[PDB]
Amino acid sequence: KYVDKIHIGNYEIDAWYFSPFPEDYGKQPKLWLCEYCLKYMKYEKSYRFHLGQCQWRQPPGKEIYRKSNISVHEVDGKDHKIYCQNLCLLAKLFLDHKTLYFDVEPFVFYILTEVDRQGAHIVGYFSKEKESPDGNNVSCIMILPPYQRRGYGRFLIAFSYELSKLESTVGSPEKPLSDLGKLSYRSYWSWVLLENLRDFRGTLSIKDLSQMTSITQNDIISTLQSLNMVKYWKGQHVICVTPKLVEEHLKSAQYKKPPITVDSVCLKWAPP
Numbered sequence: 001k002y003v004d005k006i007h008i009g010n011y012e013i014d015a016w017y018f019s020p021f022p023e024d025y026g027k028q029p030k031l032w033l034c035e036y037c038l039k040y041m042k043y044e045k046s047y048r049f050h051l052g053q054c055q056w057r058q059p060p061g062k063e064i065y066r067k068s069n070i071s072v073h074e075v076d077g078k079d080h081k082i083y084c085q086n087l088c089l090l091a092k093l094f095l096d097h098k099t100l101y102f103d104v105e106p107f108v109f110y111i112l113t114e115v116d117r118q119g120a121h122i123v124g125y126f127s128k129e130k131e132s133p134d135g136n137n138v139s140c141i142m143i144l145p146p147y148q149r150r151g152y153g154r155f156l157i158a159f160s161y162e163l164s165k166l167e168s169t170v171g172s173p174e175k176p177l178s179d180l181g182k183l184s185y186r187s188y189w190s191w192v193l194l195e196n197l198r199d200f201r202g203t204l205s206i207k208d209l210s211q212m213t214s215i216t217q218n219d220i221i222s223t224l225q226s227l228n229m230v231k232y233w234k235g236q237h238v239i240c241v242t243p244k245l246v247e248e249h250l251k252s253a254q255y256k257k258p259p260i261t262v263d264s265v266c267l268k269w270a271p272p
């Protein structure tokens, strides 16, 4: 009755949540998605026919990042409506709190792919309001289950701050965050802040850290609290940490997997 399993690329993936594909699509045992155009289909036969015919081998929009075989495409919801609606219905299978699937025009979508000889394979994405009244620099972020916990979520979170830095603005993801989203942002913020506290030497204040990283002061402060690296004095949070304790944290298991890093030399972007 609801869609409970999809086939995309060479993956079969079980759903985590309800997504409002049309009812007739839910009745089938699996929904079959083209991994390049994200068209959803009811039958293995319509899928195989589509695979032989569809000419797309990467997302639409502009390739604003490419380094080796990792790419990001910026897709404006106005310009590529059906692709963006297909993407938001795919995403809602894995996101409990996303509420927007059809009214995609106010958004831009950043699609992460891993490229081989056959084409550019979707890993995940984040959407971003073109104008955010609350200064959200991500609306929803989703990594398909077979790619989770493999460094791609860290990449996309960093990429969203690389956009904010080019916009000279701070930003924070829209709440609520998933359980894995919370842990991922906390760990990302902790790494970034701890690296800056090692590097600039050298009394940076919180407002300094916010300008260097585009992380809001509130998210810097909550992170520093979790790390016990702030004192409070006459109504003000103040950084309080030794170079040794910064190094103890940076040496922890949390930060030991080799990251896929955003190389800003490979990012081609200016404010929309």
Ligand SMILES: O=C(NNS(=O)(=O)c1ccc2ccccc2c1)c1ccccc1F
Pocket: 141, 142, 143, 147, 148, 149, 150, 151, 152, 153, 154, 155, 157, 180, 181, 183, 184, 185, 187, 188, 191, 254, 255
């Ligand atoms: O797949 C994910 N997270 N896991 S991850 O491997 O990309 C990751 C995420 C953040 C990290 C921060 C510091 C050190 C290593 C980190 C590794 C993920 C899924 C949904 C939403 C956000 C996410 F980030």
Ligand SMILES: [Zn+2]
Pocket: 034, 035, 036, 037, 038, 039, 050, 054, 055, 056
């Ligand atoms: Zn297709």
